[PDB]
Amino acid sequence: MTEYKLVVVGAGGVGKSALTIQLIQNHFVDEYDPTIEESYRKQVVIDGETCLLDILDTAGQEEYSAMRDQYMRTGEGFLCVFAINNTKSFEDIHQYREQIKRVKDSDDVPMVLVGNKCDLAARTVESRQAQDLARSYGIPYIETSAKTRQGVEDAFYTLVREIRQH
Amino acid sequence: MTEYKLVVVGAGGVGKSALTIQLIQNHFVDEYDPTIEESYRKQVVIDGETCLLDILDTAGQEEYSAMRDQYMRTGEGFLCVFAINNTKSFEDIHQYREQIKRVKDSDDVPMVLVGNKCDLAARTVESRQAQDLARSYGIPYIETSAKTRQGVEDAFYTLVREIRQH
């Protein structure tokens, strides 16, 4: 069956994991639990096609440096997450994008920008700001809550759909 | 606020209306009720942006001929629906696409192809067939059920998102 090798990337603490566990296990994780690397495989149906979601959950910062090159060479599509109440995670998006273009020999790589935690009142990252960025990158933007589950399927399925169209 | 002038197009009986009423009124309409033309306006939030969904629901066939040119000149994005158990509605998609390119002076117009009624066992339109078509048009494809509500938000929001990116 078609397999879609997806990897979830972004700054430490932004909800990369809580977002992947909502998809696979249908529940919010409200725990302190920093990822070294996790992987999730799931037979799923998206728009009538039977496919396996092969997802890599990654680390926020760590000695993950050129340690990242290896999985960014193997991922087919990227979820690039920041938190809407953490301005420096929004800003670090440029570093993750460029390194993925660098190891990919590509300016067009399947990707979607995700502003997570849209449930929290108190954002510092305005959606206009983030949607303008997603437009400059030629990237769709989708806000999410791992807490509420708002948009989580929508972010993962839009990315499976960026990969169908490339 | 941003307004997104969307119109729902396709063959008679395919679920264009049931799909629009699930979005606006949160309920399945399981009635025989052929549209001349209906319009729905709704203040909604999509990915943090406050916007009005101005949707035009249209007729399947009728004396709607160059009678369509007028609204296809005014719609910003199109939802192109067929039914997955009705081969000729899948086939009539080419006629709706081309006329929209014709009155639009455009090869790239925001659009998504929707195979509706994915709940019914007994399809005659295979998702590979329809996803290949959506790929040839440079269009995303999303299956839906107005009955179940599966994918309805997903089809309407992906189209609002095609319009953000154009």
Ligand SMILES: Nc1nc2c(ncn2[C@@H]2O[C@H](COP(=O)(O)OP(=O)(O)NP(=O)(O)O)[C@@H](O)[C@H]2O)c(=O)[nH]1
């Ligand atoms: N309210 C709110 N909190 C969330 C959301 N997503 C995650 N959290 C919280 O944010 C914190 C970090 O979540 P986690 O998934 O561990 O983030 P991470 O990006 O995977 N951290 P890391 O880079 O170290 O692996 C946790 O307290 C989690 O409950 C969200 O949608 N909203």
Ligand SMILES: Nc1nc2c(ncn2[C@@H]2O[C@H](COP(=O)(O)OP(=O)(O)NP(=O)(O)O)[C@@H](O)[C@H]2O)c(=O)[nH]1
């Ligand atoms: N089981 C199933 N039936 C559906 C679905 N969508 C619509 N229907 C049924 O299909 C029939 C037509 O629905 P309707 O919304 O009126 O279609 P239309 O495309 O708007 N007809 P028209 O072109 O004349 O205006 C109705 O019986 C409706 O309940 C769906 O998701 N699945």
Ligand SMILES: [Mg+2]
């Ligand atoms: Mg984690």
Ligand SMILES: [Mg+2]
């Ligand atoms: Mg109708």
